[PDB]
Enzyme design. Sequence first.
Site, PDB file in Angstrom:
ATOM      1  N   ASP A 333       1.050  -1.317  -0.268  1.00  0.00           N
ATOM      2  CA  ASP A 333      -0.354   0.242   0.023  1.00  0.00           C
ATOM      3  C   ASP A 333       1.501   1.179  -0.182  1.00  0.00           C
ATOM      4  OD1 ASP A 333      -1.911  -0.627  -0.591  1.00  0.00           O
ATOM      5  OD2 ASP A 333      -3.155  -1.744   1.745  1.00  0.00           O
ATOM      6  N   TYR A 418     -10.876  -0.850   0.977  1.00  0.00           N
ATOM      7  CA  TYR A 418     -11.355   0.039   2.427  1.00  0.00           C
ATOM      8  C   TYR A 418     -10.163   0.622   2.630  1.00  0.00           C
TER       9      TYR A 418
END
Lengths: 708, 705
Positions: A333, A418
């Site tokens: 990420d 998310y």
Amino acid sequence: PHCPQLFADLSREELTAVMRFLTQRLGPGLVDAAQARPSDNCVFSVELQLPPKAAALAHLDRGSPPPAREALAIVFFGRQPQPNVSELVVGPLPHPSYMRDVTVERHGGPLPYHRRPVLFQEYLDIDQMIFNRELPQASGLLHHCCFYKHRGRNLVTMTTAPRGLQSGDRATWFGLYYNISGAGFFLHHVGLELLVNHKALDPARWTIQKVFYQGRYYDSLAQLEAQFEAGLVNVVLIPDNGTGGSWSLKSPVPPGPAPPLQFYPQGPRFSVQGSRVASSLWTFSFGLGAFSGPRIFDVRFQGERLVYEISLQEALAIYGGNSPAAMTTRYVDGGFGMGKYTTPLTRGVDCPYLATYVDWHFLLESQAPKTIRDAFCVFEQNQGLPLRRHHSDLYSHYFGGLAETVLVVRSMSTLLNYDYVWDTVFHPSGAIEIRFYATGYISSAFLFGATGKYGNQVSEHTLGTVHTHSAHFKVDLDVAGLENWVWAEDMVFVPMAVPWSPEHQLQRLQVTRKLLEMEEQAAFLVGSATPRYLYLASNHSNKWGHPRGYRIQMLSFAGEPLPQNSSMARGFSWERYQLAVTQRKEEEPSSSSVFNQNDPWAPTVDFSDFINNETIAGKDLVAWVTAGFLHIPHAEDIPNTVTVGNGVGFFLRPYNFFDEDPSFYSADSIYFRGDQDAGACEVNPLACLPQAAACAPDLPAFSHGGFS
Amino acid sequence: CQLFADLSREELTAVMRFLTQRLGPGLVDAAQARPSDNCVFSVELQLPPKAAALAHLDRGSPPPAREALAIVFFGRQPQPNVSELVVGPLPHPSYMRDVTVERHGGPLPYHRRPVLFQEYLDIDQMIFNRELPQASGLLHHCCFYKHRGRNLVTMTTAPRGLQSGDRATWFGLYYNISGAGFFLHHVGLELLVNHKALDPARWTIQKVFYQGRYYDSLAQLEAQFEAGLVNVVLIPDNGTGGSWSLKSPVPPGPAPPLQFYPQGPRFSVQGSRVASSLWTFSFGLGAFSGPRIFDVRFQGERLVYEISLQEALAIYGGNSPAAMTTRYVDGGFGMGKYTTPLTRGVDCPYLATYVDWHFLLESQAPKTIRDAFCVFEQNQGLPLRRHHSDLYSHYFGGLAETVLVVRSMSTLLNYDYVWDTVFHPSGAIEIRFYATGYISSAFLFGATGKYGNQVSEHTLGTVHTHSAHFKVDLDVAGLENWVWAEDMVFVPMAVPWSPEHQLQRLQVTRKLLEMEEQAAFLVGSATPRYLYLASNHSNKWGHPRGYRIQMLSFAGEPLPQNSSMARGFSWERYQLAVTQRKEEEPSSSSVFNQNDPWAPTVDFSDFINNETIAGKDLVAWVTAGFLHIPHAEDIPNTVTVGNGVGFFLRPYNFFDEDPSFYSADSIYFRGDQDAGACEVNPLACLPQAAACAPDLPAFSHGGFS
Ligand SMILES: *[C@H]1O[C@H](CO[C@H]2O[C@@H](C)[C@@H](O)[C@@H](O)[C@@H]2O)[C@@H](O[C@@H]2O[C@H](CO)[C@@H](O[C@@H]3O[C@H](CO)[C@@H](O)[C@H](O[C@H]4O[C@H](CO)[C@@H](O)[C@H](O)[C@@H]4O)[C@@H]3O)[C@H](O)[C@H]2NC(C)=O)[C@H](O)[C@H]1NC(C)=O
Ligand SMILES: *[C@@H]1O[C@H](CO)[C@@H](O[C@@H]2O[C@H](CO)[C@@H](O[C@@H]3O[C@H](CO)[C@@H](O)[C@H](O)[C@@H]3O)[C@H](O)[C@H]2NC(C)=O)[C@H](O)[C@H]1NC(C)=O
Ligand SMILES: *[C@@H]1O[C@H](CO)[C@@H](O[C@@H]2O[C@H](CO)[C@@H](O[C@@H]3O[C@H](CO)[C@@H](O)[C@H](O)[C@@H]3O)[C@H](O)[C@H]2NC(C)=O)[C@H](O)[C@H]1NC(C)=O
Ligand SMILES: *[C@H]1O[C@H](CO[C@H]2O[C@@H](C)[C@@H](O)[C@@H](O)[C@@H]2O)[C@@H](O[C@@H]2O[C@H](CO)[C@@H](O)[C@H](O)[C@H]2NC(C)=O)[C@H](O)[C@H]1NC(C)=O
Ligand SMILES: *[C@@H]1O[C@H](CO)[C@@H](O[C@@H]2O[C@H](CO)[C@@H](O)[C@H](O)[C@H]2NC(C)=O)[C@H](O)[C@H]1NC(C)=O
Ligand SMILES: *[C@@H]1O[C@H](CO)[C@@H](O[C@@H]2O[C@H](CO)[C@@H](O)[C@H](O)[C@H]2NC(C)=O)[C@H](O)[C@H]1NC(C)=O
Ligand SMILES: *[C@@H]1O[C@H](CO)[C@@H](O)[C@H](O)[C@H]1NC(C)=O
Ligand SMILES: *[C@@H]1O[C@H](CO)[C@@H](O)[C@H](O)[C@H]1NC(C)=O
Ligand SMILES: *[C@@H]1O[C@H](CO)[C@@H](O)[C@H](O)[C@H]1NC(C)=O
Ligand SMILES: [Ca+2]
Ligand SMILES: [Ca+2]
Ligand SMILES: [Ca+2]
Ligand SMILES: [Ca+2]
Ligand SMILES: [Cl-]
Ligand SMILES: [Cl-]
Ligand SMILES: [Cl-]
Ligand SMILES: [Cl-]
Ligand SMILES: [Cu+2]
Ligand SMILES: [Cu+2]
């Protein structure tokens, strides 16, 4: 009535000044990154260059001049015979005068161009390619399955990562989803995925290497179209509208009586000034790495520094699935960016209504600094649970206890589907707690074929894909000084004869103690046993003759890590470890890199390297903690994954650090004997609460700001 | 701005009245009972047979007979025994059935009976009147002793001996510290009192241990002291600070944050039943096994028949004989019996609902523990779920998490167990327990390193483990359940589209656990990452509806199986077990285990045999605990931070979607909408709606016994 900087991220002004200095030195052909093409020169990011520790501490300790305030700019150098990405330290602030290429010094040579993050403009060109040149060729099929129109654009793409199968590849699998109005598009996969090769510096040369549709592989959209028209593709009809949790986030149930609310009857007990937080017990500096996310510096408890740096370092999602996209998805990420993807906090949902909300400033893929409003929240929370408690009916009637109130610092990164919640929690016992939660939407894929090995069906035509979550933290504890050791304490039972009755056996419980001397001894793999008490200690003792320590205690159900044989494993090898304690080194500032995502096959930082044949007995140490879990999606993840049970992280707790529990001295502590009036104000401060909390809670007007 | 209810005052009186009528004139108040008396040790609820209970609750059948179990000590006879007696029905009792032989195959031997308060009194009388004065010179010199003075107090250990039939207890001696913990003030004297005999005059001291050395008697010790051989370390009996008081020397400052209900509470408490818009259940307290909850319904549907504490265990190490052989099996005292009033605003939030508890334990008449339970809603300060979208469509969707909490606290000597049951709006249930209060300590001598840390002057904080065992009777969408194990695995394969390359294929593994042994997981084993009990029927999406068991435990190394006492708490060896729920297996422990672990009254490992767990009424048994090596920061008290262990029960393909989607308190808005308008966001409406001054009732305290 109504109830009553060394580590700071760069301010708007500072960012402005760095950009102004860069737009002079780098030449006149420099393009705004928001509209930059692969063959362009552009500035991708400008952010704080954390200071060197020795100069930082000398300033904080004996007031030596601070080290230069510096920025690090990542520049994409496309407009040249051999394109590269360069890391440039600009300084000093507030008035920049130098710019220094640190790429070679850090990496041994050029940062290859295919390691650069995909730009916003790059995604736009990919969409320009898919929607204008590629999908039109499957117009027939799409018309029948997917409510497609000439212009339309009723479908949307979602990137996966990494992009290919070996170093130098830049081929991304994009899935296509219904553009859902006001709710998560991620639950509405139309069953089409496209392997896009977007490596070339000229977007005209970009291609589709492969197509997958409802279970089957095709060499092209034309081939798919021709097979559909010939009668050989049995289309499952996925609907583009509906009601309930798989289509909406709006509750159909009207609000009822108001949920409980917390308030400060005499005003907040802490201040936030710039990037520094101060309460009667805690002092620290908070901030946000653009790529590596939430961080805290210079943590002092009751005036005494415990921690140089606690910071998020990386987050990782590894997927399985029935389709190419989810089959090969491994999100690193930081390659996208935990700061960069930080979102506004909704007052009263994301944090308690009466939290202090702080803005975040950044210069990412643009030429002028921007703001994320309410990116941080800081608040005291009454836990509704005692910190310590004793009711005595035995020989002497007395009660003594304290209700636990914690101070919290939170931000949230929303990356694609998310939402990561990052908490640092400051306890009055002197404990520090780090937790993270993965909420928001799941990724799903079109359901086809034999269900059982790749997740569960979670809604109409959709498979919730199996995956793991992991995150890595840097915990640079300086326990009563730089110089620390690592202790391992545990238990054992030794059968021996009962001294006063030798013909009988007892199992003698004993403490084992081992000093962990070399780094390898303090590297703990996922799935293996760790000593029940693991702590970093000073050389110096407490009043009672024991080394003063802080225990690292882990709360993690780690997923099995990606097997070592994978050629991409080294791109996030921190995942193999629950814990590692290394010598802190200026040249090992992060366990990851923004550059690892698009080339894990040749990682820019390989965490494994940090662990070598090196002493950890009397050195500046840093601990590295991995926290994570397997997530097999299930119905009650629809519409969103809940945070309950899914909070993983760790505690940092004092172990013979103090001479007694600091909370004995709490101002909020309660004590009374059985032979005094617990109802009287002189005896119990809680008895004055009816009177001293009879005001109307002071509440600001609700405001929410941020949809970019 | 009631099948499961503990017996009431009137009911306890009635059973007690019935017992005095039926047990004959030989019956004496247990409060002053001599070992050879007949007396009633206790009276409490006999839990109703499950089949009948469900018949009443689901099919409308007549309620099962309201019954009590009374434990009687029959000391006034040639073969002394203890008997369990079922008395019923309530409200007006009519029968008395002896169930001892039925439950245990034989009489319960008398040495199993828990030590009476009166028995502790007689032990002290012996110690202070007949025993300690023999070492008067030494005690004068070391311990500020005065003739016929009691500046010292005793503290029992357990078990009491080395084999079945023994009743010899090590008592340490401590300064009677006024208004603070006496436990941190070990005087260094420990006495092994043999109090097996039914006549207290025949009791003896088997061994003495003083400041690190053994002596045969207080007289040999005294003589050796007068002879100049005993070097006495002087332990002071007063001081200031954490090891001497609990009172902060720091004045109060600004008030800590406080939670209130803007429009009143959102749950009712009626008798033993709680109800909120999401949850329904019944709570209580077993005299010995502790907190329990029954008939847990989410939005009308029963998830769990029974969730109850079963036992708590503390296993000690140390330099001295007391610590050295301490293995507390706390049910032998009683987590209910030693329940303590909750102090409003410290033990629970100030605005919680507080509930009394009634009991009849070692007396002729029932008593009450005021404020024994608290129930409250709590804003966690955390979102239950949240999504902020900047991508393609601009919206926010979230819900702050509020939970509903039932809490009780038991104080057994030095420690305070906090028992929490938490009900989440997602349909998850959470059990947590904390051990706070004082540590147990011993006088410091010799090589420090192997038995704990020095935590104050002259004081060793003794190493020990905590464990608790819970009974979890999930009835997942019905009685008939199955056990599934899910986990993950990687399988190497060639990339379909590029076979020259490899990928690691992530997959789910799945296994049905068909026999009890398959679902027994020893401490230190790895367990399936997803372990769950499931119905046979599917959710809308074709998956068996299940509730998973997620454990949070740093469990200690269990007492080695080679120890002849290990069977007295054999549940320690398991993280998790799943067995057929049987009427003759209601508890994993027993009040009689503490004084005879060598011949256990209940042995948990017996519940695990070769039986099926495929489509039967299942019960899961969960163990949670940790090692505790005391440290300076445990002085004055052990704090609860990160020292909570237990488990989560979380829905797994149980629903068709997350129930919280339907929540009344959920929030939603788009970028085109007005985030600050009240019709859109009921949170822009809260500032003005919460402009009320919160009604705080005047502070009262439950008291002291
Ligand atoms: C815990 O640690 C601190 C310092 O930590 C370092 O100590 C050194 C010695 C290394 O072990 C290093 O790895 C540790 O991290 C302790 O404080 C130090 O204590 C030593 C005592 O030996 C001091 O060093 C001495 O200094 C005197 C002059 O002041 C010298 O004469 C000595 O040097 C002779 O001996 C060496 C032997 O190898 C020869 O090579 C030399 O030529 C000399 O003949 C000697 O080194 C040191 O200065 C202290 N440092 C500080 C900052 O106080 C501390 O005692 C300890 N605390 C506890 C409670 O354990
Ligand atoms: C990655 O790309 C950067 C940018 O293209 C490379 O650094 C650049 O190197 C050139 C030539 O060394 C510098 O331009 C100028 O060259 C003339 C002609 O000799 C010289 O007289 C000037 O003084 C000036 O240096 C340019 O300044 C420099 N860019 C900056 C601002 O750093 C870099 O070398 C490439 N990376 C690697 C490791 O190859
Ligand atoms: C444990 O001790 C108790 C008390 O000594 C034993 O129970 C008692 O057993 C005697 C049998 O010898 C019972 O006596 C019978 O009582 C009825 C009165 O209804 C009388 O009509 C008979 O002629 C006979 O005397 C006595 O009731 C009974 N006590 C009770 C109330 O249970 C018990 O046997 C001992 N446990 C074991 C298994 O040894
Ligand atoms: C799941 O189970 C129920 C109950 O099935 C029982 O059947 C026995 C053969 C045995 O396996 C036992 O353990 C199990 O409890 C099923 O309903 C049963 O089966 C049929 C109905 O189709 C009838 O015989 C009965 O109605 C019923 N039996 C009982 C005792 O209630 C049900 O079919 C099944 N469901 C699924 C999806 O598998
Ligand atoms: C997908 O559909 C959404 C509607 O959900 C479109 O969003 C609107 O777009 C226009 C023009 O950009 C804005 O002015 C509106 O305010 C948008 N509405 C909302 C609520 O955000 C969007 O254009 C579509 N996106 C794509 C990629 O086609
Ligand atoms: C231990 O010391 C305490 C405190 O000094 C004594 O308890 C007090 O005793 C008096 C008289 O019996 C009572 O009226 C008080 O209620 C007690 N005080 C408190 C604070 O509870 C106690 O008697 C001593 N116990 C012994 C002698 O072992
Ligand atoms: C989707 O469905 C609803 C019915 O609930 C309908 O009113 C709405 O117009 C649909 N959305 C669009 C614009 O297609
Ligand atoms: C570590 O260091 C020493 C050299 O000082 C050496 O003896 C040893 O080979 C090294 N150990 C390992 C595990 O490589
Ligand atoms: C102990 O000593 C303090 C002074 O240090 C004194 O004020 C206190 O009353 C003493 N405590 C008792 C109960 O003897
Ligand atoms: Ca190293
Ligand atoms: Ca350090
Ligand atoms: Ca069951
Ligand atoms: Ca069985
Ligand atoms: Cl390239
Ligand atoms: Cl033992
Ligand atoms: Cl006996
Ligand atoms: Cl792979
Ligand atoms: Cu997930
Ligand atoms: Cu403990």
